[PDB]
Amino acid sequence: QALLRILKETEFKKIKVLGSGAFGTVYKGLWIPEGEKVKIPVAIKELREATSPKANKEILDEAYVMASVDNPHVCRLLGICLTSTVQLITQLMPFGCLLDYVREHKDNIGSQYLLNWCVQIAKGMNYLEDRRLVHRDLAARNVLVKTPQHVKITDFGLAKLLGAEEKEYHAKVPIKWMALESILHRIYTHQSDVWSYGVTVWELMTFGSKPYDGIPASEISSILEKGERLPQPPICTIDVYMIMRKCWMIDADSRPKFRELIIEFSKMARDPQRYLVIQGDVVDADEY
Amino acid sequence: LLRILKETEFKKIKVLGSGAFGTVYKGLWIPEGEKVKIPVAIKELREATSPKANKEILDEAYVMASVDNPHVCRLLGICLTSTVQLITQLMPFGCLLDYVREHKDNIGSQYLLNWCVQIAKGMNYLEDRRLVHRDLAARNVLVKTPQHVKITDFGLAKLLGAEEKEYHKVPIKWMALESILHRIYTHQSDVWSYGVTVWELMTFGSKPYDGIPASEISSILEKGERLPQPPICTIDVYMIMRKCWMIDADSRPKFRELIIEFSKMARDPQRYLVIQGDVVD
Numbered sequence: 001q002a003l004l005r006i007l008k009e010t011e012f013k014k015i016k017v018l019g020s021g022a023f024g025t026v027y028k029g030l031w032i033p034e035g036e037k038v039k040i041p042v043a044i045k046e047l048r049e050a051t052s053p054k055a056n057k058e059i060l061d062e063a064y065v066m067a068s069v070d071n072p073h074v075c076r077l078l079g080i081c082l083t084s085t086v087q088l089i090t091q092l093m094p095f096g097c098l099l100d101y102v103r104e105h106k107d108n109i110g111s112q113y114l115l116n117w118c119v120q121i122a123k124g125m126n127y128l129e130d131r132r133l134v135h136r137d138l139a140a141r142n143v144l145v146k147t148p149q150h151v152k153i154t155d156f157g158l159a160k161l162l163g164a165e166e167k168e169y170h171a172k173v174p175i176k177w178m179a180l181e182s183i184l185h186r187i188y189t190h191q192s193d194v195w196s197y198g199v200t201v202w203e204l205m206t207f208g209s210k211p212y213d214g215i216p217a218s219e220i221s222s223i224l225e226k227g228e229r230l231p232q233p234p235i236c237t238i239d240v241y242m243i244m245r246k247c248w249m250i251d252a253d254s255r256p257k258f259r260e261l262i263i264e265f266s267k268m269a270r271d272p273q274r275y276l277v278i279q280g281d282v283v284d285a286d287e288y
Numbered sequence: 289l290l291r292i293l294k295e296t297e298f299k300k301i302k303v304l305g306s307g308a309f310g311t312v313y314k315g316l317w318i319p320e321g322e323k324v325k326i327p328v329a330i331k332e333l334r335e336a337t338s339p340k341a342n343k344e345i346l347d348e349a350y351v352m353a354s355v356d357n358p359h360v361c362r363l364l365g366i367c368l369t370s371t372v373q374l375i376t377q378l379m380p381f382g383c384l385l386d387y388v389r390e391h392k393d394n395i396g397s398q399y400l401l402n403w404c405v406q407i408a409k410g411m412n413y414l415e416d417r418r419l420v421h422r423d424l425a426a427r428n429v430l431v432k433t434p435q436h437v438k439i440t441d442f443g444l445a446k447l448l449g450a451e452e453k454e455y456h457k458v459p460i461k462w463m464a465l466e467s468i469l470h471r472i473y474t475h476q477s478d479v480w481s482y483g484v485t486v487w488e489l490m491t492f493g494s495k496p497y498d499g500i501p502a503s504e505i506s507s508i509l510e511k512g513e514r515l516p517q518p519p520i521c522t523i524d525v526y527m528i529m530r531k532c533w534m535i536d537a538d539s540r541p542k543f544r545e546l547i548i549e550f551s552k553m554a555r556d557p558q559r560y561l562v563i564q565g566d567v568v569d
């Protein structure tokens with residue numbers, strides 16, 4: 001497939017810095033297709049130079065698979081701009097990430113919503129799993145809100161790009177969302193994505209709580225083998241907490257499977273009150 | 289032209305920023321029945337914020353919804369209850385004040401003079417339909433694209449009671465002395481604000497009279513003080529600004545004359561300014 005526009009530096013424009021990341025910067029910008037009067041709002045993620053342990057040929061390869069994900073719950077790479085720095089063009093999400101969303105609404109968010117988002121993130125992930133792909137960096141900060149009732153998983157592929165996989169590579173890494181095998185041996189698989197998924201749900205049930213507050217990154221491995229795990233969210237019924245605890249098992253193949261999770265959460269979403277107890281010119285990526 | 293919405297045809301998703309008498313939200317306009325979710329910006333006015341009755345509020349809202357110019361945002365809808373809510377189109381790139389701040393020097397003459405022409409245009413438009421903005425300022429100019437700015441918040445000041453003399457925060461440092469002293473608002477009082485606005489743009493975001501209380505601005509204006517010549521400005525360009533800050537209101541430039549003096553400069557910018565070089569929408 002193609003579906004990956006290759007843009008020239010004069011076909012996009014960086015307007016405002018959305019926010020800065022660990023290895024780059026994101027931007028509120030405009031896509032301006034050469035040879036036509038159209039301006040499309042987009043998000044431009046620019047990776048810092050020499051930040052990726054890969055040459056351009058390899059980079060562009062991965063961008064094709066990135067630009068080839070077709071699922072309502074996974075964002076699609078729209079275009080790329082390879083030079084002395086790689087820039088990623090994706091659709092602009094006006095309502096930001098889901099983490100900041102559950103934080104701003106520490107409460108006025110009902111159960112139905114929470115279990116809903118869990119089903120969706122489980123759908124995007126399963127999709128990837130079927131296509132035999134590993135996200136390697138799933139977190140509530142990496143889930144964007146298209147509309148309150150439809151969230152998409154963003155940043156597919158980025159980690160593999162920044163060289164997560166590369167064995168000998170010695171570059172930050174999201175330790176607090178990583179499975180023991182990822183932290184210990186840098187092994188990434190679908191069952192290691194499940195751990196991150198379990199951490200993600202946790203972030204959502206706590207309305208944006210930081211995992212292992214205070215606990216240094218370096219201690220996380222030791223605390224995990226000692227048997228420690230993120231605590232049961234207050235609004236969570238033991239039935240819900242266990243599923244998360246099952247995503248945090250040492251044995252990778254023991255952990256649930258996104259397919260099972262979709263059914264397990266789809267079930268609870270039919271009677272949420274029982275499983276969660278809460279008190280209460282400028283076109284568009286779409287029109288193109 | 290003014291859609292009247294039910295408190296169920298729109299959702300306030302994220303707070304853009306809660307200003308003086310209210311809050312601006314980033315939400316979704318879900319036309320009842322239709323199958324669309326349009327991103328919009330919802331500004332909600334605090335309660336009792338306005339000294340007027342809804343019956344009248346709606347009137348102004350019809351006017352606000354009638355502004356038809358590419359350089360003046362248009363009131364898409366309204367939701368009248370115990371609070372008034374204004375639905376306008378969402379400007380993802382924000383306002384221009386924040387833009388010149390985040391680009392202290394990446395912006396060349398061509399742009400700056402350009403924006404001055406556009407703002408002059410939107411403003412002229414309102415004068416022509418016999419309307420007064422009353423609160424023009426860099427923060428009230430939103431960026432649709434780097435090369436097209438439209439004036440936002442037409443109507444708000446009026447609504448919040450600027451004209452109701454009897455009715456006791458006001459953008460003092462952008463107001464014509466006649467506004468500050470007698471609460472008088474006219475096209476020629478908008479020109480003063482316009483000059484202060486060009487001042488903001490020419491200083492890449494500087495604050496007007498930074499350090500001087502507001503209760504004192506009335507003084508230093510009669511004492512003859514005015515905003516200092518911006519570094520990148522040529523005296524040719526600075527006088528246009530100074531002329532906008534005259535005591536004799538009818539002696540200040542008119543927008544129609546400003547659209548021409550700035551357009552003339554916009555032809556040879558380097559000579560008037562000196563710098564270093566579901567979801568439709």
Ligand SMILES: Nc1ncnc2c1ncn2[C@@H]1O[C@H](COP(=O)(O)OP(=O)(O)NP(=O)(O)O)[C@@H](O)[C@H]1O
Pocket residue numbers: 018019020021022023024025026043090091092093094096097141142144154155
């Ligand atoms: N497509 C998009 N639409 C809207 N906002 C986006 C988009 N992509 C990224 N952002 C925002 O840009 C900011 C930076 O993105 P990014 O660097 O990917 O964040 P992050 O995951 O928090 N970084 P890190 O913790 O270093 O991995 C975040 O605050 C995101 O909300």
Ligand SMILES: Nc1ncnc2c1ncn2[C@@H]1O[C@H](COP(=O)(O)OP(=O)(O)NP(=O)(O)O)[C@@H](O)[C@H]1O
Pocket residue numbers: 304305306307308310311312329376377378379380382383427428430440441
């Ligand atoms: N239509 C819009 N699209 C995008 N952002 C908007 C829109 N209208 C208002 N805003 C933003 O909402 C915030 C609050 O606006 P408003 O309440 O009008 O305050 P303001 O007068 O710009 N700010 P201040 O300088 O604090 O008085 C500002 O940061 C604006 O940039």
Ligand SMILES: [Mg+2]
Pocket residue numbers: 141142154155
């Ligand atoms: Mg991200």
Ligand SMILES: [Mg+2]
Pocket residue numbers: 427428440441
């Ligand atoms: Mg404003």
